């Protein structure tokens, strides 16, 4: 039975001992890496390509660096090859991927978790709201989401006002302080990065937004490591994240190996052919068996966005002692 | 380029090697294929093979029947038909590659294969 | 297992028209990003030529008069202007299950 290479690239030291334990056989390989950056990423990774054939890599890190996911995007589109971004930066969702990428990740998509996030204000009556975004992509998606689900709404949701910040450009000005205002509504939806979320909480700070009467949802883009919360942010915040809890990375490294082999065994047994490496620093066929895959017991299907059609939820409280706090799942 | 060499007539339940000739490009790359044109004037694939041997396809019409081998170092296509039967009369073609890459490329002149007593 | 239906099964142009053969399949054979499928000739005591490369893609070698169409499960091939040199018969091929088929073919007679 012939076998299929494939690299698990983690910056940061975690389980080996104990994460491990057919139609077509696999073959991993371990790689630390100690940085994420364009450079260091980019060079490491195509290292491995011409060192030894490698088909795909499952890709984690312990950090909220969102540009992972970014550059990972990049790295697939250039040489036809499966990346997986299972954990940190690499499942920070990327929305607007190139149409030849094939670059997946774990995590809710964007749709998904606005539709969570109004099922919760469902739950509290918060039929008044506004949204605040930047320029990170999804902002169009998000607030689209949303509007949509207003528009066929047999509740009569105030979206008061809505707002765009560029964070691109500097604000000796306060256009950021100035726009803030603008917001009365009990409750504010903020889709940004956890960084942008940081600067734009110290504004919201300063113009008693982050007051009690006031309430944020933010999604999982800002979460990140649900351990750390910078000491700029207010606290009873709700956000949605992956259920990094319950469902620990042991799991998500056996989804990540078992996804990519699954694909290898039907496109090879049906086309006759695994792609051959470009070890250079023509079918994505492998996407179609990417997109719906099964592996013993449970459903691993990506949308042909590109995002898990079952993502595992947990909804979640910045509580009494600033730390995240399941409320539900 | 290419072409077939090595047809003929042979009886039922026998068997025949047929091989074709390869000429200017790197014979270990591509996806090498077997096809039947029937008298009827249709055509059904026979058998596929890798690059090097890792996966001999055929559908089940001729499964076990026949047998498809490459040679990479003196570029030579071969496939071997066995324990034949009448169904198998037809002009056999020898046809290659999509480089990843699924459908026949480039294609022989085919050579007449007939299976009678 | 996927089946073809090619149409019509002959056919007769005036040289200089536009000529069209089609198929249609069992099963969608395309993805929302690209689509999988090639087309044939055939000439008296010939060797089987490939005219379109995935679905609506000229190959190397074969007149610009030739060009594809299609998605989902209907394809089509079209010959603009028809010359006396495309007299032949022309095969349908797709490439998603591992049974690779072809059509029942299709005549091209040209109006003499």
């Known amino acids: 039975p012939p076998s299929i290479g494939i690299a698990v690239i983690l910056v940061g030291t975690s389980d080996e001992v104990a994460i491990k334990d057919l139609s077509v056989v696999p073959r991993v390989e371990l790689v630390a890496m100690n940085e994420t950056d364009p450079k260091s990423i980019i060079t490491r990774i195509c290292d491995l390509m011409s060192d030894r054939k490698i088909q795909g890599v499952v890709f984690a890190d312990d950090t909220d660096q969102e540009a992972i996911a970014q550059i990972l995007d990049f790295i697939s589109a250039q040489t036809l090859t499966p990346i997986l971004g299972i954990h940190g930066g690499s499942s920070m969702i990327m929305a607007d991927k190139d149409e030849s990428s094939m670059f997946f990740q774990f995590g809710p998509s964007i749709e998904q978790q606005a539709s969570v996030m109004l099922n919760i204000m469902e739950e509290y009556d918060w039929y008044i709201f506004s949204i605040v975004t930047t320029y990170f992509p999804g902002y169009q998606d998000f607030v689209n989401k949303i509007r949509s689900t207003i528009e066929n709404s047999f509740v009569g949701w105030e979206l008061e006002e809505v707002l765009l910040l560029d964070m691109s450009l500097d604000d000796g000005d306060s256009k950021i302080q100035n726009q803030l205002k603008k917001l009365q509504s009990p409750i504010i939806l903020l889709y940004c990065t956890k960084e942008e979320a940081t600067y734009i909480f110290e504004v919201a700070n300063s113009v008693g937004l982050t007051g009690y009467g006031y309430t944020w949802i933010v999604p999982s883009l800002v979460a990140g490591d649900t351990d750390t919360v910078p000491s700029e942010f207010p606290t009873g915040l709700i956000s949605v994240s992956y259920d990094e809890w319950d469902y620990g990375l042991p799991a998500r490294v056996r989804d990540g190996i078992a996804i990519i082999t699954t694909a290898a065994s039907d496109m090879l047994s049906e086309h006759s052919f695994i792609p051959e490496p470009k070890s250079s620093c023509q079918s994505n066929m492998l996407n179609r068996y990417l997109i719906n895959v099964t592996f013993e017991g449970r459903d691993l299907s990506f949308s042909e966005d590109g995002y898990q059609m079952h993502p595992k939820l947990v909804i979640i409280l910045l509580n009494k002692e600033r730390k995240w706090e399941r409320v539900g799942k | 380029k290419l072409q077939e060499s090595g047809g003929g007539s042979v009886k039922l339940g026998g068997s025949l090697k047929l091989s074709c000739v390869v000429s200017?490009?790197?014979?270990?790359?591509?996806?090498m294929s077997w096809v039947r044109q029937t008298p009827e004037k249709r055509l059904e694939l026979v058998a596929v093979?890798?690059?090097?041997?890792?996966?001999?396809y055929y559908p089940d019409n001729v499964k076990g029947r026949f047998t498809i081998s490459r040679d990479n170092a003196e570029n030579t296509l071969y496939l071997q038909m066995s324990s034949l039967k009448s169904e198998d009369t037809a002009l056999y073609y020898c046809?290659?590659?999509?480089?990843?890459?699924?459908?026949?490329?480039?294609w022989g002149q085919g050579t007449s294969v007939t299976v009678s007593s | 297992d996927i089946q073809l239906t090619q149409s019509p099964a002959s056919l007769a142009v005036s040289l200089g028209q536009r000529a069209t053969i089609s198929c249609r399949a069992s099963?969608?054979?395309?993805?929302?990003?690209?689509?999988?499928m090639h087309w044939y000739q055939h000439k008296p005591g010939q060797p089987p030529k490939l005219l379109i490369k995935?679905?609506?893609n000229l190959e190397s070698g074969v007149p610009a008069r030739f060009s594809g169409s299609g998605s989902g499960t209907d394809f089509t091939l079209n010959i603009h202007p028809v010359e006396e040199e495309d007299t032949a018969t022309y095969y349908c091929?797709?490439?998603?299950?591992?049974?690779?088929?072809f059509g029942g073919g299709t005549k091209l007679e040209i109006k003499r």
């Open positions: 091929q797709h490439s998603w299950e591992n049974p690779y088929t």
């Open positions: 046809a290659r590659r999509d480089y990843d890459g699924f459908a026949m490329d480039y």
């Open positions: 099963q969608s054979v395309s993805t929302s990003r690209y689509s999988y």
């Open positions: 200017g490009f790197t014979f270990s790359t591509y996806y």
């Open positions: 995935y679905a609506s």
């Open positions: 093979i890798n690059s090097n041997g890792g996966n001999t």
